[PDB]
From a paper:
The potassium ion efflux channel GORK plays a critical role in closing plant leaf stomata by releasing K+ from guard cells to reduce guard cell volume and turgor. The GUARD CELL OUTWARD-RECTIFYING K+ (GORK) channel is expressed in Arabidopsis guard cells and encodes a K+out channel. Voltage-dependent K+ channels, including GORK, contain three regions: an intracellular N-terminal region, a transmembrane region, and an intracellular C-terminal region (27–30).
As a result, five different structures of GORK ranging from the transmembrane region to the C-terminal ANK (designated as GORKWT1–GORKWT5) were determined at resolutions of 3.16 to 3.27 Å. Closer inspection of the structure revealed that the difference of the degree of bending in the C-linker between Mol I and Mol II was small in GORKWT1 but greater in GORKWT5. Additionally, GORKWT1 displayed a C4-like C2 symmetry in the CNBD, whereas GORKWT5 showed a pronounced C2 symmetry. This region had an α-helical structure in GORKWT1, while in GORKWT5, it was entirely present in a nonhelical loop conformation. The Cryo-EM structural data showed that K514 likely formed salt bridges with E508, E517, and D511 in GORKWT1, and that L516 engaged in hydrophobic interaction with I457, P466, and F467 in GORKWT1.
Residue numbers in the entry:
A (entry chain C): 202 to 514
B (entry chain B): 50 to 514
C (entry chain D): 306 to 618
The structure:
Amino acid sequence: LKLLFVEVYCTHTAACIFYYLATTLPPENEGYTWIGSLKLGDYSYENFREIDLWKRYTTALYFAIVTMATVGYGDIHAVNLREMIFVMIYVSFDMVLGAYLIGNITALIVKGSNTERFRDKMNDLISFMNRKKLGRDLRSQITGHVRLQYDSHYTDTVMLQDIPASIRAKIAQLLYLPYIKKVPLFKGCSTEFINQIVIRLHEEYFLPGEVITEQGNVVDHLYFVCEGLLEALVTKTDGSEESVTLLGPHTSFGDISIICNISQPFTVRVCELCHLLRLDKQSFSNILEIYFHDGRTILNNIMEEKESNDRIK
Amino acid sequence: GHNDYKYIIHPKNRWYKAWEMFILVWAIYSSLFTPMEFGFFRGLPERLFVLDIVGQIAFLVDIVLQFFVAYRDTQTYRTVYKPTRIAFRYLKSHFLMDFIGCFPWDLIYKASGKHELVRYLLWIRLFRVRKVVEFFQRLEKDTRINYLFTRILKLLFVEVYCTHTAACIFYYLATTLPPENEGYTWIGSLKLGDYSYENFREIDLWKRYTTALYFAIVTMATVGYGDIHAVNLREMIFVMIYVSFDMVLGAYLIGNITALIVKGSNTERFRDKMNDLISFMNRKKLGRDLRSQITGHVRLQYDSHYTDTVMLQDIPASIRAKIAQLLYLPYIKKVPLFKGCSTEFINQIVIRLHEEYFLPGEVITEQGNVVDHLYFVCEGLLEALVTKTDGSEESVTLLGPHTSFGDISIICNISQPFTVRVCELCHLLRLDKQSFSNILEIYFHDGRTILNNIMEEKESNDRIK
Amino acid sequence: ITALIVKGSNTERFRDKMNDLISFMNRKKLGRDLRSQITGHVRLQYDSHYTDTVMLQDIPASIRAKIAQLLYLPYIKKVPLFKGCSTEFINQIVIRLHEEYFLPGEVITEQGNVVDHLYFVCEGLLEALVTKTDGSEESVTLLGPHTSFGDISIICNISQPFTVRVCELCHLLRLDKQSFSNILEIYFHDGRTILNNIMEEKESNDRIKKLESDIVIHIGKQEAELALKVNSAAFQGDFYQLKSLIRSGADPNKTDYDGRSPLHLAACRGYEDITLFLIQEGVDVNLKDKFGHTPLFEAVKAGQEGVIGLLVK
């Protein structure tokens, strides 16, 4: 924008100076000036000193703007030696300044982010997927999840890796904290423990119908639903999976298997787009290796809370 | 919700896609004809009276269908199929402009006493180019065509439209002057060759349009021959505006192309590395075989696409897990370490896996280095050696495909016994020690079954003995 | 054309590297002499293709070892410091070295400094500036091509005997203390070959020959003190330090000033694992100390019946 404004000022000044150099010659020699000898169509700018001000300004600015884009129609052109020198200076300077404009626009475009980077990531991912000949539905899952990640700004976490663990912990305690309070799994805990639980959390968004974790699996991620609706399904030998509970907002799941040190009791399947905080089972464990008072208070809360659902109980 | 309210069309429904390709052609024609019928026609002649009417009808139906097609939400990201919800989207987003465009503006102009200001409303039909904008946006999603290439093609179409409209406006500005003063216009004084455009309002439509478009195109590339130039003050002002905007547009075109060349370099990166690396070999006179080894590694870097294995860290855990369950699971079965265990244990090994590729001659694990990863040789051959006190290395049994090495050291929780070497290109599937350890704790019976397989694998190779 | 120009100019990279450095130097308000030496050294680095190491960053260990054995190894094999070595040892150092080019009329190392890195001489002559009590210098050895410096201190566990002086432009070959120490513990007989060389090549060296008298003493107290560390670890119970110490070239057959073996100490203490490892070495089961105590009698004296079981075994 600064360079375009410099273009505006420079062309306006060039038009004014060019017409001025036309006026420097005495009127009797008007035939040797660029405007006094200018015959466009029928109108001949003969007594150019006595033509309407805006007609003269439009003519001079016409030339200036034309030369700025180097169209060089030639209809209006330098005739004098003073006009020759001024036009030389003007176009020589305008070359560099228009090259600066081109360079700034090109640098802007080169600094392509968001849709540009995501597009590149999509192309690389599509190539890799073709190499693995993955399931077309699973291919849709891959593409949909990363598209969601683009819209749900998953790459934000990469940026958050730059800011050190201190300010990062502050970002987490200023955002994840209410959501972690609402979850009843941590009904009673210490401030340090809850802060550590918040720090290691990672945001992730999931697409409806998908499987968060398979049943009978070594769960390595306790999740905390923030938005949307999730659910748990009881797969038997026949495959007649049965609903356990609609994992609504603030319904932590995977903690049962994690604390019980058992396999995933129920396949966790998605119903709507869900925002989930994530905590690696290992991380929750190491925080338990320190604040085990907190963990046994959980264990009591596990008793009383799981009493609610007979499937969970 | 698509059953809840019928007649609703899916956003990517097949018939709607066909109608999109049809209304896209009509939108291109309407946006490329409105400037023509505006500038070159002070009243559309009856010869094309049908062709305009049908045109509006073509969009009139589209005004109705867009009131039934569903739209994917930007909040729940889910397609919403409710006419109550669907209609509001049109009524707010673009219904006004499309509806104003659909009026018989030419007929209204001819039915109001030939008032030009009424004909100025014809430019509302230029907003039908939003269809072409949507088409280009959708094409950008397709990985078939580069995003920057789509950008440059969009900019080329922008130049096409801008030059066409500029030529039409230029001829219109020529027509605004009265015929008796036609000599003051840009066209009424044109004397190209022996042909003078004296009575320019009576020339054939295509000769006039080609002259105006010749001006527009030669000024688009700023060739500025000067044969056709602005003469009026309205013509001067319009040429200044067009020239400035086209300077900006051409700068953007050069920027898009330059960014496509700079950023969009895939094998050129390997070539750039080759440049200075070949300089290295040449200034140091490396053996041709060693030169081949280095070039093989660099090509390998672009041929192993480890980046295509790094991406999986970004895909979430479960979906990555199913990728593993469909690819690494055969390789997992091939392992003699697992052999016959519970399908669940095998599946958990499958889930947590990190595919890697290595280079011939380069070594992978070192003697005395605490094992941190459990490697399966899936497609390749691998050979370990142990440096003694004198220094000579101790050859061991080679690790051919469908085997698992480093497992014993992980089981004993001891450093890597022998410095292992990559003989050639190997599909070295990797399992972290901690993941395998947790999997073993959950599946203790499978763990003991592995222990049996382990004793058999111990007698299998005397170096593990 | 823009991409060709923006791919970076080898000089522009150098200029950018230099600028950044100079900005740091002025930011720290540095002095002219040091600035000139720094800028010159950056110069010699860039035109001698310092970035080759950067290029060598990506090609793996085997190929890097091969190019090393094709460039450095012919030059290293002509260095008498490593004549008599197993060729394996020489090639190993050759994997772990770094060429460096210094400006004429300079200095790297300083008499009495911590040696850290070790240096060879691929080409050029160097002057062994040994600062006296008054402050003057005398060169008792001229380090020409296929010579070495820094070795005297590392291999003999002293500090550098000399402030080395760069007589002219010189390409030398760097070997870190820590890596050299690794490769030196890997090999044993040729490490003693090093030591013997360091003695026999100390002939031209004269003030380093008084250093060499102290070096005779240094080999003496090195093996003695090494044995004392082995015995002290045996008594203390640091089995891990026992392993590391024996892997530092320690002789399990060495006894301390009381003619007491580390086996003896572990026997009287009862550390049957230290005893067992020194057994794996093969220390005499029937050795007698100055006081007549045998590892057997050492074990029986303190009632170390487990150690007695290992001993009778």
